[PDB]
From a paper:
Mammals depend on dietary uptake of Cobalamin (Cbl), which is a cofactor of at least two enzymes that are part of essential biochemical pathways. CD320 is a member of the Low-density Lipoprotein Receptor (LDLR) family, a large group of mostly multi-ligand receptors involved in cholesterol uptake and other physiologically essential functions. CD320 features an N-terminal, extracellular fragment comprising two LDLR type A (LDLR-A) domains separated by an epidermal growth factor (EGF) homology domain, the exact function of which has so far not been determined. While the majority of related LDLR domain-containing receptors bind multiple and distinct ligands, CD320 has been reported to bind TC with high specificity and affinity as evidenced by the lack of interference in TC binding from related LDLR ligands like LDL and RAP as well as high affinity for TC of both the full-length receptor and its soluble ectodomain81318.
Deletion of a single glutamate (ΔE88) in LDLR-A1 of CD320 has been associated with Cbl deficiency observed in patients carrying the mutation. To investigate whether a structural effect was underpinning this defect, we generated a complex of TC with CD320ΔE88, characterized it biochemically and determined its structure at 2.6 Å resolution. However, the purified complex displayed increased propensity to form non-specific multimers as analysed by SEC, requiring an additional SEC purification step for crystallization. As the mutant complex structure was of lower resolution than that of the wild type, we confirmed the positions of disulfide bonds and bound Ca2+ ions by using anomalous difference peaks from data collected at a wavelength of 1.77 Å. The TC-CD320ΔE88 structure revealed a similar domain arrangement and binding interface as the wild-type protein and we observed no significant changes in TC or the LDLR-A2 domain, ruling out a gross structural effect of the ΔE88 mutation. As seen for the wild-type protein, the region of LDLR-A1 carrying the deletion (EEE loop) revealed poor electron density and higher B-factors when compared with that of LDLR-A2 (average B-factors for LDLR-A1 and A2 Ca2+ ions ∼112 and 56 Å2, respectively). Moreover, electron density for the Ca2+ binding residue Glu86 as well as Glu87 and disulfide forming Cys88 (equivalent to Cys89 in wild type) was missing. However, the centrally bound Ca2+ as well as the LDLR-A1 acidic necklace was clearly visible in our structure indicating intact Ca2+ binding. Even though the apparent Tm of the complex was slightly lower than that of the wild-type protein, approaching that of the LDRL-A2 domain alone, the mutant protein bound TC with equivalent affinity to wild type with a calculated KD of 1.5 nM. At least in vitro, these findings rule out a compromised ability of CD320ΔE88 to bind TC.
Numbering used by the authors:
A (entry chain C): 53 to 85, 129 to 171
B (entry chain A): 1 to 68, 78 to 409
């Protein structure tokens, strides 16, 4: 009971896009689903992304490869 | 003492919910409102299976447009979407979730830079959205740096610049309260503790002789904040009871018709606040809402409203005839239909926001202010305020 360019789901039947499929996270129901950084910023390791220094070791992976939350924790 | 709002009439509350009910079927991205969802979940009222579909729509819209539309949501609206996830006992998670978090964190970082190491600069949005964004990240146990919190602290601390509304102060207090309960910024612990007290006294001092905190529409969010902590040395109980009397009179006078305003008030009427989203109780029983079967009466009366704009040369002043019960927006529509008048609106969670009048769009830190006679700013927007016969409505471009 769903469209062609969207997915369908098997427990809700709520249809879901399928650039969502299936992207290592549970979107459904069931489960069938160089440009130099600014000063004070920091470059990701496996990419070009830049993030504020203050986002390093703040408990959330802001880099696509979680580079900022590796080497946690230090002392001092 | 403690801030307590004794329960009200169930029929008054259900009446509020019935105003909210039509929006549950409006799933257009233009109409989607995370605040409505939050307010309904924190209430004693329920829409049943309609809620799940509403949440799914929020998840679709927000995650595809911010990570991909027409008008993708703002970052302020993303913050409220986060509150909605909590209202369903969800933590923001997975790669899309994680990236949405960082987008909101970027929002706060940009706004911090705009304010400056100096603290003169204004946020591109408002301190309200600044506080709201901190709250949203905190509710999902996402930490922000001390320097971000400092901006909110300095905005309310002693010898601060600018003046803030009760609404803005309440939202700040809610942010601070979440940080304090979560032990999230220990380097700012004592300042956060003092800020909460500061916000409390500012709000109590802002209490009008009628009982409201600022105005009728600031009272809900103010009460939310006041309910979250006790206030020793002060008389919080009496203040909140006098607010209840004021609130009650406003309800019986039909003051609350706007959906977002209702969504901010309903948690209060259920003894809950946004702070209850730290430890949400998603399965607490709620009364099912059924559509009000009410026959709407059709008026037979014509009223005339004078519309005037003096912010532009040459000025505009016309008497507009509309059906009795019409809104300001209806008056605007009819003025446009007569020729010689044009305007623009944009969508928001509070409804249509007036952005342009007769070719002139409000610029930075400007807006088109709505006033009635005599020189009295409206407390409602163009889609809610309903002018009396003979009233004069002014659209004034002001800087703030
Ligand atoms: C900051 C703010 C505040 N405002 Co103004 C105030 N004073 N607002 C807006 C500001 C927008 C600009 C900016 N820099 O953000 C600001 C300073 C210009 C202002 C002006 C309006 N406000 C005023 C009111 C009365 C509304 N505003 C509030 C949302 C009162 C708010 C307090 C509150 N309790 O919400 C408020 C603190 C925070 C709104 C917010 O950011 N929400 C979160 C955000 C993520 O959701 P959002 O929907 O995407 O936000 C947009 C809308 O709120 C829109 N918007 C703002 N106010 C309104 C009002 C209406 C009626 C509509 C349809 C849209 C808006 O601007 C925001 C985007 O910047 C409301 C509670 C304030 C209040 N206590 O009276 C109230 C609304 C009352 C009601 N019954 O709905 C004005 C009507 C005043 C007037 N007589 O002109 C005016 C709208 C005129 C117009 N052109 O339509
Ligand atoms: Ca998936
Ligand atoms: Ca990080």
């Amino acid at each position: 009971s769903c469209p062609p360019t969207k997915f369908q789901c098997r427990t809700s039947g709520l249809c879901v896009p399928l650039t969502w499929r299936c992207d290592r996270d549970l979107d459904c129901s069931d489960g069938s689903d160089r440009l130099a950084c600014l000063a004070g910023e920091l470059r990701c390791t496996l990419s070009d992304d830049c993030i504020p220094l203050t986002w390093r070791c703040d408990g959330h992976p802001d880099c696509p490869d979680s580079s900022d939350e590796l080497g946690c924790g230090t002392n001092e | 003492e403690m801030c307590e709002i004794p329960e009200m009439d169930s029929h008054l509350v259900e009446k509020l919910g019935q105003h909210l009910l039509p929006w549950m079927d409006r799933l257009s991205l233009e109409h989607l409102n995370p605040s409505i969802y939050v307010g309904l979940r924190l209430s004693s009222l329920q829409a049943g299976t309609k809620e799940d579909l509403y949440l799914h729509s929020l998840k679709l819209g927000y995650q595809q447009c911010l990570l991909g539309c027409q008008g993708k949501p703002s970052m302020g609206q993303l913050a409220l979407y986060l509150l909605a996830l909590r209202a369903n006992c969800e933590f923001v998670r997975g790669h899309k979730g994680d990236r949405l978090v960082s987008q909101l964190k970027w929002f706060l970082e940009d706004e911090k830079r705009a304010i400056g190491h100096d603290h003169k600069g204004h946020p591109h949005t408002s301190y309200y959205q600044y506080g709201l964004g901190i709250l949203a990240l905190c509710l999902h146990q996402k930490r922000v740096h001390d320097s971000v919190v400092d901006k909110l602290l300095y905005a309310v601390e002693p010898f601060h610049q600018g003046h803030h509304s009760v609404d803005t102060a309440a939202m700040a207090g809610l942010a601070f309260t979440c940080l304090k309960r979560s032990n999230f910024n220990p380097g700012r612990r004592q300042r956060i503790t003092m800020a909460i007290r500061t916000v409390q006294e500012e709000i109590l001092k802002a209490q009008t002789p009628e009982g409201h905190f600022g105005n009728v529409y600031s009272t809900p969010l103010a009460l939310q904040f006041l309910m979250t902590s006790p206030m020793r040395g002060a008389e919080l109980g009496t203040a909140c009871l006098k607010a209840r009397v004021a609130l009650l009179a406003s309800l019986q006078d039909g003051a609350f018709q706007n959906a977002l305003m209702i969504s901010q008030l309903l948690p209060v009427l259920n003894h809950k606040t946004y702070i209850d989203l730290i430890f949400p109780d998603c399965l607490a029983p709620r009364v099912m809402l059924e559509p009000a079967a009410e026959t709407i009466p059709q008026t037979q009366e014509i009223i005339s409203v004078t519309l005037q704009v003096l912010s532009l040369l040459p000025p505009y002043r016309q008497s507009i005839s509309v059906l009795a019960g019409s809104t300001v927006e209806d008056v605007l529509k009819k003025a446009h239909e007569l020729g010689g008048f044009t305007y623009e609106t944009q969508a928001s969670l509070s409804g249509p926001y007036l952005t342009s009048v007769m070719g002139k769009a409000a610029g930075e830190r400007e807006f088109w202010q709505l006033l009635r006679d005599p020189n009295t700013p409206l407390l409602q927007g163009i889609a809610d305020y309903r002018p009396k016969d003979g009233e004069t409505i002014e659209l004034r471009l002001v800087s703030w």
